[PDB]
From a paper:
The carbonyl reductase CBR1 was first isolated from brain and has been associated with two cellular functions: (1) detoxification of xenobiotics, such as the anthracycline daunorubicin and (2) metabolism of ketone-containing cellular messengers, such as prostaglandin E. Genetic studies that have intended to uncover the in vivo function of this enzyme have focused on the xenobiotic detoxification activity of the enzyme. Using matrix-assisted laser desorption/ionization (MALDI) and electrospray ionization (ESI) MS/MS sequencing, B1–B3 were each identified as human CBR1, a member of the short-chain dehydrogenase/reductase family of NAD(P)(H) oxidoreductases. CBR1 converts daunorubicin into daunorubicinol, a compound that lacks the anti-proliferative activity of the parent daunorubicin and is cardiotoxic. We used affinity purification to identify a target of hydroxy-PP, carbonyl reductase 1 (CBR1), a short-chain dehydrogenase-reductase.
We overexpressed human CBR1 in Escherichia coli and attempted crystallization of the protein in the presence of hydroxy-PP in an effort to enhance design of a selective CBR1 inhibitor. The structure was solved by molecular replacement with the AMoRe program using a modified porcine carbonyl reductase model and refined with SHELXL to 1.24 Å with a crystallographic R-factor of 10.3% and a free R-factor of 13.4%. Although NADP(H) was not present during purification of the enzyme from E. coli nor added to the crystallization experiments, one molecule of NADP was found to be bound in the CBR1–hydroxy-PP structure. Hydroxy-PP binds to the substrate-binding site of CBR1, with the pyrazolopyrimidine core of hydroxy-PP mainly surrounded by hydrophobic residues (Trp229, Met141, and Ile140). The phenolic hydroxyl group of hydroxy-PP, however, points deep into the substrate-binding pocket and interacts with Tyr139 and Ser193 of the catalytic triad. The phenolic oxygen is positioned 2.5 Å from Oη of Tyr139 and 2.5 Å from Oγ of Ser193, thus indicating strong hydrogen bonding. The C4 carbon of the NADP(H) nicotinamide ring is positioned 3.2 Å from the meta-hydroxy carbon. Importantly, the structure of CBR1–hydroxy-PP provides a molecular understanding of the basis for the strong dependence of CBR1 inhibition on the presence of a hydroxyl moiety, as this functional group serves as a key interaction determinant with the catalytic machinery of CBR1. The binding mode of hydroxy-PP in CBR1 also explains the tolerance of the pyrazolopyrimidine core to derivatization at N-1, which allowed attachment of hydroxy-PP to solid support and affinity purification of CBR1. Importantly, structural analysis of the hydroxy-PP–CBR1 co-crystal structure revealed a small space in the active site capable of tolerating a methyl substituent at this position.
Numbering used by the authors: 2 to 276
Write the structure that this text describes.
């Protein structure tokens, strides 16, 4: 019977902000906007208040384990857990950024894969029955999968892969870039794309454990692509507004209590894609 709660990571701008706004109107309970920068997060909450909405705020940097754990403790204390988690935070380097490629790989992987993973380690145990988890991946993960060796494709499509095996492979990509050997070892050229392979596969693994370990709790967990969205990441020439980009993530967050699925899927335009 307690009040329900939804939370979005990377909520101060871009798709994440639009997701928060829609959950404020459509989610029955509190909605927590989180942001790594407290100033930007509070400004975004003030923006939504000027629109008539009442999100809560909590700081969260998915790359700081102490930030994650403080949020965990807040959720336990204030709500006794969590109903909806949207792992939206992510980064990408632009074309021709002068940062060395192996550092771009390390940095992008650190946030998009390892930060996401650490949020899930701490917050998935808090998800309540009928909860939903939404991981914002990218269609670039499907695109990058095709460019992997056959051996890595089999590993990434496996229904038996463990989280610890995936972790090893994600770190292997990054180390291989530093050694100048990633393509020889079967990896694609796109570092961002490999990080999103990690998000997609992590989603599949976490869904399988939910089915294995929490039969009966009616939790649904999926990965998704929001499409090509005008944000600071993609720039102003992209196809969709943030409002449009939010639609598939919000759909997946708000799947009705009696939904049988999707679960463990990669979803774009509200439709399941083959992995
Ligand atoms: N735009 C697009 O076309 C597409 C985007 N995506 C994915 O959608 C998600 C949102 O992207 P988008 O809105 O475009 O990007 P933006 O750059 O506009 O927004 C990214 C959000 O993530 C936050 N963030 C980044 N790193 C961290 C971190 N360490 N801890 C907490 N928050 C963090 C940012 O905070 P801050 O303001 O402090 O930087 C910001 O709130 C990402 O996962 C992206 O990979 C997928 C497909 C397409
Ligand atoms: C119907 C939903 C809940 C998606 N929605 N969206 C919006 C909306 C409209 C314009 C921009 C935006 O971000 C959201 C909205 C509104 N203004 N009033 C009532 N419901 C609204
Ligand atoms: C630059 C192109 C047009 C190839 N692009 N970029 C993206 C893109 C931009 C930023 C992040 C991301 O994951 C993907 C994209 C997309 N989601 N769908 C279709 N085309 C896309």
């Amino acid at each position: 019977s307690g009040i329900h709660v939804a939370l979005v990571t990377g909520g101060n701008k871009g798709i994440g902000l639009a997701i928060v706004r829609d959950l404020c109107r459509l989610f029955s309970g509190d909605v927590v906007l989180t942001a790594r920068d407290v100033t930007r997060g509070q400004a975004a909450v003030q923006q939504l208040q000027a629109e008539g909405l009442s999100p809560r705020f909590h700081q969260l940097d998915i790359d700081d384990l102490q930030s994650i754990r403080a949020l965990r403790d807040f959720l336990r204390k204030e709500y006794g857990g969590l109903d909806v988690l949207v792992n939206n935070a992510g980064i990408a380097f632009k074309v021709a950024d002068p940062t060395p490629f192996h550092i771009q790989a390390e940095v992008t992987m650190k946030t998009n894969f390892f930060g996401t993973r650490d949020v899930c380690t701490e917050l998935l145990p808090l998800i309540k029955p009928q909860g939903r988890v939404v991981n914002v991946s990218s269609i670039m993960s499907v695109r990058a999968l095709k460019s992997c060796s056959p051996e890595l494709q089999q590993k990434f499509r496996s229904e038996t892969i463990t989280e610890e095996e995936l972790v090893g492979l994600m770190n292997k990509f990054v180390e291989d870039t530093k050694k100048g050997v990633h393509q020889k070892e079967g990896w694609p050229s796109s570092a961002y794309g490999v990080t999103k392979i990690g998000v997609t596969v992590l989603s599949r693994i976490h869904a399988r454990k939910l089915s294995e370990q929490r039969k009966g709790d009616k939790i649904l967990l999926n990965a998704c692509c929001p499409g090509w969205v005008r944000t600071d990441m993609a720039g102003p020439k992209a196809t969709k507004s943030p409002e449009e980009g939010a639609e598939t993530p919000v759909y997946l967050a708000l799947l009705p209590p009696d939904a049988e699925g999707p679960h463990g899927q990669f979803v774009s335009e509200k439709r399941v894609e083959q992995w």
